[PDB]
Design a protein around this ligand. Structure first.
Ligand SMILES: COc1cc(OC)cc(C(=O)N[C@@H]2[C@H](O)[C@@H](CO)O[C@H]2n2cnc3c(N[C@@H]4CCCc5ccccc54)ncnc32)c1
Ligand SMILES: COc1cc(OC)cc(C(=O)N[C@@H]2[C@H](O)[C@@H](CO)O[C@H]2n2cnc3c(N[C@@H]4CCCc5ccccc54)ncnc32)c1
Ligand SMILES: COc1cc(OC)cc(C(=O)N[C@@H]2[C@H](O)[C@@H](CO)O[C@H]2n2cnc3c(N[C@@H]4CCCc5ccccc54)ncnc32)c1
Ligand SMILES: COc1cc(OC)cc(C(=O)N[C@@H]2[C@H](O)[C@@H](CO)O[C@H]2n2cnc3c(N[C@@H]4CCCc5ccccc54)ncnc32)c1
Lengths: 358, 358, 358, 358
């Protein structure tokens, strides 16, 4: 019973999620990407945008652009591994989307302009059944971080779900094992060295909301705020008002690291922490949280689909020798690749549970 | 008789030109910047954008934002070295600009949205007397490159002048001397290694017009076309259909180089050419054309206001030892800085000429 | 009869070549890498360096480090897909190497310290049969370019061969067809936009031989000289004194592009040339010279083992509309990857022929 | 009574220090740089190196190379603002240096090969009176951080002094006011986002000591260790065993930032801390410690000679709303520029104090 999904906003995130679907070989069999919606319907451009990626390389599948009617001037259909995907024209209000007429049940909202529970619900008024916002949402939409609180998802109450942010999906797992393994977390501050994103500018440009963020991205270290910290609070209730962090945008196309600094509740050691994370990574967090014993650098995580991959050497080596409460944990993440796979995971999960509960 | 000027579009180019004026110490005395126009009138932001620049550093003048009336919520006035500059609200049609009302004669069109002779004339219909487009223009506007064909300016026939492109202001001078010194130029192809611009994307983004140009700028070598070559033909009649070139946008915030390859009309030597360029650079091209005997690198030309600075060493060392016709000439240019100083020069020239002829 | 090869110098070049072998699935079966030589024998480190590459990624094979005798403190043997590779200690003079005792017939010289025919012969006096220099050589060593003049290899006369430079292996193919297809080549100047290399400095450093080359590599456009052009003369005699070029080091970790400008012997067209290259790329040049009609960028050629991949769109779009003699041809190349495969190819070629002539 | 100083090792560090002398306009008048010592005495190359700096641009003084005698083949004397500086040939053992014969009293040890108290003392045996090492030193060499503990310099007891590291000169200040203002500091962990340095590599190279540090610097986020934390322990004894930190080398040629996360001894607020730092910056720390209310990015600190410049906004905006103990303070520093100025300051201080005590 192919999950009928539709992508709204075929940009970095959008394509990444689609590529995530194809990559896992779900296209056609498990998931049915009925269509993608964007300011353009030029299937040839998307084809080009999917066949070539500066950071992730070439896709393992074949992509081709075709016309729906020999009548049309430019291709408006995308064919991936045989499957046909319609390139729908973008709309102002989601409610004006032919989701219903297309048979789309799950809508992947990745335009970044409908991060509000209310506005996002327009997709349901357009014929959709469920909406996954590929970013942090407001308006009180249920936020889920695969591997930490998917079970809290209710097919009957939650219709607009948020997968949180790429950053949150790296911290939450760590924090989860930290609290689950009773290490406790009195308070904690986290710093994130992040790769520049699409919202940044190549040369000092305009940015009325984030002045610093409007400066030459590839040649500056740009500080910035991040709700990723507080956000972990919605996913892990016991951490509300206990966390907060900041971000440092630095000259790299992709892959970011997280430097979590926290104070435990009871005496403990960095080795105890180190072993727990690894243990958890080999058990209830396997697939979501991983680790490494090697001397790696950002590029070594490109295309790593774990939400958070703990740096053992970095952590063990940079903590006070005999400290018992004040600690620093380091974990990496491929902000683009990993988050993409999680989006898909959430959809499949939602789909399954939505079907089971009938 | 302060030149009443206005700036339409206060972005990279816009400010750059305004900073050039102040930098030259013309603000207030020689040139009077009555006001600037943009999608925002937040003088504070503008002050910020001017007091801080990733590539050029801190300005030599002081900048402060003030309120026209203590009644306004956010500053709307700029104050450079005493001179007050009004921050006007942008309009859809240049004609709807209070140029006459403000007493602005010369308008610097740097929005990039009115590069067409016709649309640009709107400023005049708006009360403006003259217009200098800070970019290549169409609609049959007089294109002028200081130090090459300014004399061809007619105070009564040319009302919308174009200062050409940053690149053309580099190749033009070289070609000019190459022709004037009777070296002759049968045909010629020019490659340009260019720093990425504001139109490029930090990460693989959208770009329907220039597909490659949409790819991550700071981490790729991106080929593109350039009218800079053919354009020299408008500035130097004898080169029509003789020149053409391409570009390669590379990972640098600013500073570009030109690799001109041509064939002479009569047997000569690279040594001859070398000496001619240098001679011209110390004479009729001084201020516009410069040269260097040092082993410089892109960075070394940052803030160099010459339109084009010939690379003697690079040139002498990379040509065929005994060649007499096929040659390669190399020259750098601070694509941002220099171009800006030329626009001002162009405005001061037209001004001085427009006045002289009464 | 597995070819007995040895690698002297295990740096970027060294490893790359080895990896090229493994990558081609020749390790153990076709080619037998008896041992590698370098200032260090820490197999663990080598393993690390092979398993993680910032530019090429993770290898398709398994690499592990082991000890020759449980007696040694640190691993001194590499195990690739089962095959055992010895980590010999480096020597001052190549003749002091146990090439004979080791059973090494073909020695890949990639230290860069023995680029001279004489010094290189040291290896043979050390027991080696043939020597292939992974760089341009002097002393009068036969220089070969796979796909252009390998047929000029004399098993009985050539005991020290040079696979030329990465840049040459890109130009030669193009120049080769251009001449074979009788387009003729009166003269020509080529410009190469090259990615920075290991010899360059991260920040302004010391470089008494190449002043420019000593400037911050990832933040500048650095000109330099290059025999790559004149060198094509040694592979293609008919072009001696006709070719020459320069280089521009730019902010990228890998992949370079060649911009060849030349004048033909007879009247022709850019289309003729475009078709001739593609045709050759699909026939006698397949494997060595490829092409592409896509809007690619540097990143798109990573791990492209073709010596030279002609850019059709770039070429066709940036030449004079009706030109008949002055043309520009653009071609990309993975200076690291491709060159590495050719070195391997050359060794196998020589091996096959050296074996055939008994 | 111009201070007689000599520079041993004229590289990045070497030159920066010298340039810092000239920049402050002390050359000839206040400080007499008698000569510099390096593996090369090519004044022309040093002249070049000082006249062109990628990150710091052109100098505010003139630099020319001359010959000690018309007989010498290549210049060996440096002339800055009329002052003559001798270029002496390097030696294995500092003690073989003609310091005494040249009349040098204060030697700035910046080769990076004599960071050990014992080895460095050779300079004195060579005729020198005092030695200032421009890096962290071992062997029990007094370490001073201008603005924090210069008063602990003993003319009669300390002959070999260390100016610590660029990073310590940024952390010490903050920590100093944090303790002096009685905010206390139970424990603290500092993370530093650092620009790549000269010890790093352009492309994946060799680094037996620091494996990750051997990876492509300009295209990776590379974690490393740093004694900068523990080092502040020697400068401010009250913090022994309380601090520690790690580093993140990122893709930038200069300018680093420190992220200090500490726990106060008594309840307070980030606003309290904020005000204290700002206050101290306008009083007893002026010149050493600075702050900023602006939305600045790394590039804005280029050529800022303050040891550490506190980021108010970044701080006030990224802490827990009502926290009273767990805090995060952010501060920048031009790792090259600043440190250089401090080295000079220390020398002057030592000189003044040495003189005073007769
Ligand atoms: C791929 O081709 C192009 C071409 C283009 O301009 C020519 C823009 C983009 C681009 O920005 N593309 C955006 C980018 O890829 C991503 C957001 O980061 O989503 C895309 N996007 C932007 N706006 C929308 C939208 N509705 C808007 C809501 C706001 C008002 C409005 C009014 C009329 C029509 C649509 C809309 N619906 C779906 N995807 C969107 C892409
Ligand atoms: C400084 O703060 C901001 C804020 C902002 O959005 C919130 C956009 C910009 C920005 O893009 N700023 C642009 C940028 O700096 C530069 C082009 O590269 O010109 C700026 N620019 C863009 N459009 C205009 C304009 N009129 C437009 C022409 C057609 C449409 C239209 C409709 C109603 C009213 C005006 C206009 N007039 C002057 N400068 C402009 C700057
Ligand atoms: C991988 O581990 C390390 C560790 C190291 O220092 C600790 C250096 C290197 C390194 O530079 N490694 C070099 C690098 O990987 C590559 C060149 O790009 O070749 C390596 N290399 C440099 N010199 C030699 C050499 N002989 C030299 C010729 C000159 C005189 C001399 C005297 C005594 C002993 C050896 C030699 N033989 C083999 N490989 C070499 C590698
Ligand atoms: C500027 O031109 C050049 C040219 C050159 O080689 C041709 C090397 C350098 C260079 O490395 N330059 C180094 C670089 O600029 C800086 C370190 O960051 O210090 C330089 N440097 C390296 N070694 C020394 C030294 N003594 C060494 C100690 C080690 C053994 C030894 C043996 C005989 C004679 C001297 C020495 N004394 C002073 N500066 C040094 C610079």
């Amino acid at each position: 019973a192919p999950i009928k999904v539709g992508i709204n906003g075929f940009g970095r995130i959008g394509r990444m999620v689609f590529q995530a679907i194809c990559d896992q070989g779900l296209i056609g069999t498990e998931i049915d990407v009925v269509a993608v919606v964007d300011m353009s319907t030029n299937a040839e451009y998307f084809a080009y945008q999917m066949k070539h990626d500066t950071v992730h390389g070439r896709p393992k599948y074949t992509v081709e652009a075709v016309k729906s009617s020999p009548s049309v001037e430019t291709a408006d259909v995308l064919v991936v591994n045989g499957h046909r995907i319609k390139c729908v024209k973008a709309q102002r209000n989601p409610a004006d989307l032919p989701w219903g007429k297309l048979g789309v049940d799950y809508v992947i909202e990745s335009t970044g302009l409908f991060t509000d529970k209310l506005k996002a619900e327009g997709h349901i008024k357009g014929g959709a059944k469920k909406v996954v916002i590929s970013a942090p949402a407001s308006g009180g939409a249920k936020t889920i971080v695969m591997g930490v609180n998917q079970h809290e998802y209710s097919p009957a109450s939650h219709h607009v779900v948020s997968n949180a942010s790429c950053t949150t999906n790296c911290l939450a797992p760590i924090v989860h094992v930290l609290t689950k393994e009773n290490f406790g977390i009195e308070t904690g501050l986290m710093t994130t060295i992040h790769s520049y994103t699409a919202t940044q500018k190549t040369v000092d440009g305009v940015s009325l909301k984030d002045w610093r963020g409007g400066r030459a991205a590839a040649v500056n270290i740009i500080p910035s705020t991040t709700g990723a910290a507080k956000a972990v609070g919605m996913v892990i209730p016991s951490t509300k008002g206990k966390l907060t962090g900041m971000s440092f945008r630095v000259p790299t196309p992709d892959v970011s690291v997280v430097d979590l600094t926290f104070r435990a509740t009871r005496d403990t050691s960095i080795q105890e922490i180190d072993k727990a994370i690894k243990k958890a990574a080999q058990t209830y967090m396997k697939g979501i949280l991983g680790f490494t014993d090697e001397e790696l650098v950002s590029a070594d995580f490109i295309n790593d689909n774990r939400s958070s991959v703990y740096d053992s050497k970095a952590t063990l080596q940079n903590n006070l020798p005999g400290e018992k409460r004040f600690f620093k944990v380091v974990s990496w993440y491929d902000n683009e690749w990993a988050y993409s796979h999680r989006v898909v995971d959430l959809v499949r999960y939602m789909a399954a549970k939505d079907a089971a509960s009938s």
